[PDB]
Design a protein around this ligand. Sequence first.
Ligand code: DZ4
Ligand code: MG
Ligand code: MG
Length: 428
Amino acid sequence: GPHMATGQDRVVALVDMDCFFVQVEQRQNPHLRNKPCAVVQYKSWKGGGIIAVSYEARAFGVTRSMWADDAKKLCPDLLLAQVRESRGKANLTKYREASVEVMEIMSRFAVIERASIDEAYVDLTSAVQERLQKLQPISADLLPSTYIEGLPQGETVQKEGMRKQGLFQWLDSLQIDNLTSPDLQLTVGAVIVEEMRAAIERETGFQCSAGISHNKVLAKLACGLNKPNRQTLVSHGSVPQLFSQMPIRKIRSLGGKLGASVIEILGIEYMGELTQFTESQLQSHFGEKNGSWLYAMCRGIEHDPVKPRQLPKTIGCSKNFPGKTALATREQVQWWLLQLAQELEERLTKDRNDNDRVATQLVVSIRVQGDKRLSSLRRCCALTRYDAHKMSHDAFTVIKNCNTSGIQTEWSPPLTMLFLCATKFSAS
DNA sequence: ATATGACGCT
DNA sequence: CAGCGTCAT
Ligand SMILES: Nc1ncnc2c1ncn2[C@H]1C[C@H](O)[C@@H](COP(=O)(O)NP(=O)(O)OP(=O)(O)O)O1
Ligand SMILES: [Mg+2]
Ligand SMILES: [Mg+2]
């Protein structure tokens, strides 16, 4: 007990934008605000594929991975915004630039780790220490949008009434005399996150949600508990009851094959049930690293650091050529490699100017018709010049021998995907 | 017919 | 300037 680590050393937050692509389009087009709206890419096939949905539209059952024509059946008044198309492909520049707006604001408060186009982890341990040294009870007024997971226990017919009662129980209990209380550190962390989220909304117009806990996995989980436009504090103490009915697939990194194996091999359904197994038992089934990770995680402990990185490590461009449209001619493959290369060149040139770095490697990936893998083959070559013509020519050079066609003009088996990625950045 | 990113394994 | 698999938004 006296020597058992509790994973309460850090204060970490995960901030995730609410229906991000939609909010970007709603800021731009006021007509879309406060309406059932979705963002779609490529209109010709079934109205386009939905990639983002406003909360108003979710109420009708509209989801991502849904064709717009089908979404309209569920929600006839659904409004749509289209992703920009350039050179025959979706262009996500608007969303990347909006992402930068948000990341730069977050970086003012603390070290952050860009985790996706719309979320970042924040290591608030130091900021909390400074704020505690600076502060004195914490008023509920400092936590206007915060939920305390697990509370209240023991006006509650409405959600805001429930939120306040839980917050009151939490604050009434808080021991502010001790600067080392983990619960107190989380609370101060939540105050700072309120301030961060206020700054994001004020300076960008975008709303977001956040999770505050002692590690990245719990912070991420916490974030989704009360979306949209709210933040949730998950304390170490809230873990046993939270994990008691938490499907294993809900924890980050367990949503795939590993997660399925955990369920199948151990015959369990919830994250908390993992506590019954010894570390060695878990390592035997899932490997040394996964086993140790699972053993600590089911107890609410994780040590993965918030990495000091707010810029992407790679810059890539990709396009699918489904079914009948699979590229079947050499000239066809070269023309598309050129479109991808030109987009990549623009993005790389801007990156070099903004971030004082240059990519030194080019990775080319493709999918062959009949293969359900994300990638069928991957090859690389030196990226010595930011020249689209050289990059597309080099990319063809490295994959051209995959062509099994006896005939020079033709390409077989036809390609269902092209991917160009710039990597191995070096200071410039 | 359904654009990206990180990172682990070998 | 290795190539493939997994998990993610
Ligand atoms: N599978 C995918 N394909 C393409 N784009 C994707 C996508 N998943 C997400 N996006 C893009 C579009 C998304 O807007 C953006 C953020 O991803 P989230 O955070 O997962 N989802 P959102 O922010 O929309 O809603 P909220 O968080 O409130 O639930 O990334
Ligand atoms: Mg989001
Ligand atoms: Mg997200």
